[PDB]
């Protein structure tokens, strides 16, 4: 709740700012994924 | 008993094997079509996804959820959401369901449709119950989960028909045969030697009579007798499919009649 | 993407009518009723029964194109007897046959076990 | 990739059936033939809906996060 | 079904027969060799340059990327960025001019040269419509 990013291998709720570039927290790998939105999406069920 | 003549010989909770006597082929037919195609039902038709960490994509499950058999027994007293005066849905037009499960163990955790949960008010009607024929007791099989994967959904089941999507079909497979030997010669049987030794005698060849070589071709004869059988998915019990079939056929025959009455006006 | 929404199968659009009835120019005492949002499940019955009535000369139907849900039924009748009636009597005659089936089935279904 | 619900061709539900199938082959030792038949799967479009489906899900589960 | 065509069961389709998922990947970076001119990721607007794309930017947050949940189509901007030249000229990337779908994953990394680098994925389900080659 207020989360911004997640690294790929383990899944740590990171959320650092520009003038920080990349990197995890005690897991390193400069990979990183953008979490999800909270505009909880609606499906045609067809 | 004054016209069209049914007689069951075998019947279960998903099988109605019966002869249907004394009818126009053109009708028998239009019955089977409107059966498959036009009997109303309830099935999930809008999925709001909270979280989904499954190996399966969103729209996939959504689809899977569609097909799940949901009780439609009392369905003919729930309103079409296109009709109901509410903005989007309500309990007057829709049942709402909730699904969550979550990876708990090491061993693969299943998500049955038994894990489905009504939320909205049924106002005491018989509707929206995921149907289970399963002996073990587990409806269908939505999805599967490893150690740490949630799934948070919100199903809005709505009234609808097969003509809109085969999810709304109640019917499955309908058996249909008339005139087991070719006495009406409505077909011309392919062969290499004996037409008879080569094709198979349909089980429906005892309740009719053999032709007898001597007799010439009976021409002015037409189609009576149709050896049908109705299977059911089981939103509706078998009897009500055929009933409501005859019903909806009648209702949409009936509405033409009304439409002619509405046009004398101007 | 060009695909035409499902419900345009059973729902009427706008300014459209469940029937439009028009007079055939070719023959006398002949008519071709259009049937919006319908198909064979309905036309094939109307017709075949509209053929048990002995005061009807001609009766045919056709799905002009399986893309759209129309279907045109054209009927010709004896001196006097307006087609509408023809279409009427038959429409009913079917409801009655259907009603009977309903009850007849309802009777048997009740006699069985399982 | 997860047993389909309902065969594309007939309609009849076939989801609830995967499990039982597995069991009737490998536990009390039958041939896929008779096993497809205990389940009430006669019509062979709805017979081929099970005998062919391949449960890949088992394999995506494997991948860790 | 004439001249090498075929008619299919509309019903069985809704029931799933022959459905696909179609994931597609877009991709981006920030300039490279520069001591006074370096690209930047941000949900832009005016600022002297006014060369911006036709479409909707609003699907973007603050980092310059769309979030995963979001639906996209038409000329929806999907990754915005500015090349500040002597102030800030646009260089963002619209979702394909013909496409449509739901964002799946969004990759944020660096390249060997210290680069800020991006890989937005988009997903459709493509249902067997009329003329599709079989
Ligand atoms: Zn990490
Ligand atoms: Zn409502
Ligand atoms: Zn089948």
Cα–Cα dist E82/E90, whole Å:
5
Residue E93: give the domain boundaries: 20-127
Q: At what angle do helices C83-109 and B238-261 cross, to 10 degrees?
A: 160
B166 three-state secondary structure = coil
Radius of gyration for the alpha carbons in chain E, expressed in angstroms and rounded: 20
Among E8, E16, E20, E128, the residue to mutate for chain D (most D Cβ within 10 A): E16
Query: Residue written as tokens 């799934």?
Result: B151
From the CA of E69, how many Å to the nearest CA of chain A? 5
Active site residue E4: yes
DSSP letters, A7-34, are: -SSS-------SSS-S--SSS--S--B-
DSSP state of B217: P
Q: Among the bound ligands, name the one nearest to the CA of residue B90.
A: 2
Q: Among the bound ligands, name the one nearest to the CA of residue A8.
A: 1
Q: Considering only CA atoms, which of B71, B33, B15, B24 is closest in space to residue B246?
A: B33
Where along chain C do its domains lie?
A: 1-114
- A22 to A4, A19, B179, D4, E94: CA distances (angstroms): 13, 9, 77, 42, 25
C-alpha triplet E55, A2, D64: angle, nearest 5°: 90
Where along chain B do its domains lie?
A: 1-40+167-266, 41-166
Q: Which residues contact B37 (CB under 8 A, 6 or more apart)?
A: B161, B162, B163, B169, C41
Cα–Cα dist E128/E134, whole Å:
10
Q: Considering only CA atoms, which of B165, B114, B101 is closest in space to residue B141?
A: B114
Residue A23: give the domain boundaries: 1-46
Which homologous superfamily does the CATH classification assign to the domain defined by B41-166? Answer: DNA-directed RNA polymerase, insert domain (2.170.120.12)
Q: Which parts of E17-70 are beta strand (E)?
A: 20-25, 28-29
- Structural domains of chain D, count: 1
Of the partner residues C40, C100, C106, the one whose CB lies closest to the CB of residue B4: C100
Element (H, E) at B101: strand B94-102
3-state secondary structure C49-113: HCCCCCCEEEEEEECCCCCCCCCEEEEEECCCCCHHHHHHHHHHHHHHHHHHHHHHHHHHHCCCC
E15 three-state secondary structure = coil
Of the CA atoms within 13 Å of residue B74, those in its CB half-sphere come to 14
PDB resolution in Å: 4.0
Burial of E19 (0-12, 13-18, 19+ CB in 10 A): middle
The neighbouring-strand residues paired with B42 are B159
Cα–Cα dist B199/B203, whole Å:
13
- B122 to B91, B118, B127, B139: CA distances (angstroms): 7, 9, 7, 20
Cα–Cα dist A22/E38, whole Å:
17
From the CA of E70, how many Å to the nearest CA of chain D? 22
C-alpha triplet B255, B257, B262: angle, nearest 5°: 90
The neighbouring-strand residues paired with E29 are E117
CB A8 within 8 A of CB A29: yes
Residue D53's domain is classified under what CATH number?
1.10.10.60
Radius of gyration for the alpha carbons in chain A, expressed in angstroms and rounded: 14
CATH for the stretch C1-114: 3.30.1360.10
Q: Considering only CA atoms, which of B1, B201, B176, E10 is closest in space to residue D9?
A: E10
Residue A42's domain is classified under what CATH number?
2.20.28.30
Cα–Cα dist E89/E49, whole Å:
5
Cα–Cα dist B228/B245, whole Å:
14
Method: X-ray
Q: Which contacts (CB < 8 Å, 24+ apart) does range E87-92 have? A: E87/E47, E87/E48, E87/E49, E88/E44, E88/E47, E88/E48, E88/E49, E89/E49, E89/E51, E90/E44, E90/E49, E90/E51, E90/E52, E90/E53, E91/E39, E92/E44, E92/E52, E92/E53, E92/E57, E92/E64
Cα–Cα dist B142/B147, whole Å:
17
Q: Considering only CA atoms, which of C72, C95, C10 is closest in space to residue B258?
A: C95
Q: What is the largest CA-CA distance in chain D?
A: 41
Element (H, E) at B58: helix B58-67
Output the CA B91–ligand 2 centroid distance in Å.
6
Q: Considering only CA atoms, which of B33, B11, B118, B111 is closest in space to residue B70?
A: B118
Selected residues 29-58 of chain D with any CB under 8 Å from a CB in chain E:
none
Selected residues 28-57 of chain D with any CB under 8 Å from a CB in chain B:
43, 46, 57
Radius of gyration for the alpha carbons in chain C, expressed in angstroms and rounded: 18
Which homologous superfamily does the CATH classification assign to the domain defined by B1-40+167-266? Answer: RNA polymerase, RBP11-like subunit (3.30.1360.10)
- B39: its two tokens: 């009997």
Residue E98's domain is classified under what CATH number?
2.40.50.150
Query: Residue written as tokens 């060369």?
Result: E51
C-alpha triplet C76, C80, C82: angle, nearest 5°: 55
Counted across chains D and E, CB pairs separated by less than 8 A come out at: 16
C-alpha triplet B255, B259, B262: angle, nearest 5°: 140
Q: What is the largest CA-CA distance in chain C?
A: 59
3-state helix, strand, coil in chain B (%, to 5): 20, 20, 55
Q: How far apart are the first and last CA of chain E?
A: 13
């Amino acid at each position: 709740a207020t989360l911004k990013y997640i690294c790929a291998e383990c899944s740590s709720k990171l959320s650092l700012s520009r003038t920080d570039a990349v990197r995890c927290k005690d897991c390193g790998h400069r990979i990183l994924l953008k979490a999800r939105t909270k505009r909880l999406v609606q499906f045609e069920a067809r | 008993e004054e016209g069209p003549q049914v007689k069951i010989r075998e019947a279960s909770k998903d099988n109605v094997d019966f002869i249907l006597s004394n009818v126009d082929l053109a009708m028998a037919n239009s019955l089977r079509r409107v059966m498959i195609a036009e009997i109303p039902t309830l099935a999930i038709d809008s999925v709001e996804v909270e979280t989904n960490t499954t190996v399966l994509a969103d729209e996939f499950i959504a689809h899977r959820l569609g097909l799940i058999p949901l009780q439609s027994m009392d369905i003919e007293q729930l309103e079409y959401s296109r009709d109901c005066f509410c903005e989007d849905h309500c309990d007057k037009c829709s049942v709402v369901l909730t699904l969550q499960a979550f990876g708990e163990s090491e061993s693969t955790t299943n998500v049955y449709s038994k894990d489905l949960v009504i939320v909205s008010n049924l106002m005491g009607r018989n509707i929206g119950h995921p149907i289970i024929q399963d002996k073990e007791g587990n409806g269908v099989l939505i999805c599967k989960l490893r150690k740490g994967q949630e799934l948070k959904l919100t199903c809005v089941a709505k009234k609808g028909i097969a003509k809109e999507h085969a999810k709304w079909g109640p019917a499955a497979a309908i058996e249909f045969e008339y005139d087991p030997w070719n006495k009406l010669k409505h077909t011309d049987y392919w062969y290499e030697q004996d037409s008879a030794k080569e094709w198979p005698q349909s089980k429906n060849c005892e309740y009719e009579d053999p032709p007898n070589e001597g007799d010439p071709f009976d021409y002015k004869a037409q189609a009576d007798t149709f050896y049908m059988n109705v299977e059911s998915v089981g939103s509706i019990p078998v009897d009500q499919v055929v009933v409501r079939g005859i019903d909806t056929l009648q209702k949409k025959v009936a509405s033409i009649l009304l439409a002619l009455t509405q046009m004398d006006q101007d | 993407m060009n695909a035409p929404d499902r419900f345009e199968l059973f729902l009427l659009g706008e300014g459209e009518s469940k029937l439009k009835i028009d007079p055939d120019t070719k023959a006398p005492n002949a008519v071709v009723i259009t049937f919006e949002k319908e198909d064979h499940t309905l036309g094939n019955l109307i017709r075949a029964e509209l053929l048990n009535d002995r005061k009807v000369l001609f009766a045919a139907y056709k799905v002009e194109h399986p893309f759209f849900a129309r279907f045109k039924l054209r009927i010709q009748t004896t001196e006097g007897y307006d087609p509408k009636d023809a279409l009427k009597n038959a429409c009913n005659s079917i409801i009655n046959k259907l009603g009977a089936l309903k009850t007849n089935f309802e009777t048997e279904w009740n006699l069985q076990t399982l | 990739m997860i047993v389909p619900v309902r065969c594309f061709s007939c309609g009849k539900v076939v989801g609830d059936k995967w499990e039982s199938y597995l069991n009737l082959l490998q536990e009390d030792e039958l041939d896929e033939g008779t096993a497809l038949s205990r389940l009430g799967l006669k019509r062979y479009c709805c017979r081929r809906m099970i005998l062919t489906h391949v449960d890949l899900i088992e394999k995506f589960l494997r991948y860790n996060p | 079904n004439q001249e090498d065509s075929m008619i299919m069961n509309q019903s069985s389709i809704d029931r799933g027969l022959f459905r696909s998922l179609f994931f597609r990947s877009y991709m981006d970076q920030e300039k490279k060799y520069g001591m006074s001119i370096t690209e930047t990721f941000e949900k832009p607007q005016r600022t002297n340059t006014l060369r911006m794309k036709h479409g909707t930017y609003d699907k973007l947050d603050d980092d310059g990327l769309i979030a995963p949940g979001v639906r996209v189509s038409g000329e929806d901007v999907i990754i915005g960025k500015t090349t500040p030249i002597s102030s800030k000229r646009d260089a963002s990337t619209p979702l394909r001019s013909t496409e449509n779908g739901i964002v799946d994953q969004v990759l944020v990394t660096t390249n060997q040269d210290g680069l800020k680098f991006v890989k937005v994925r988009v997903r459709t389900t493509k249902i067997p419509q009329i003329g599709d080659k079989f």
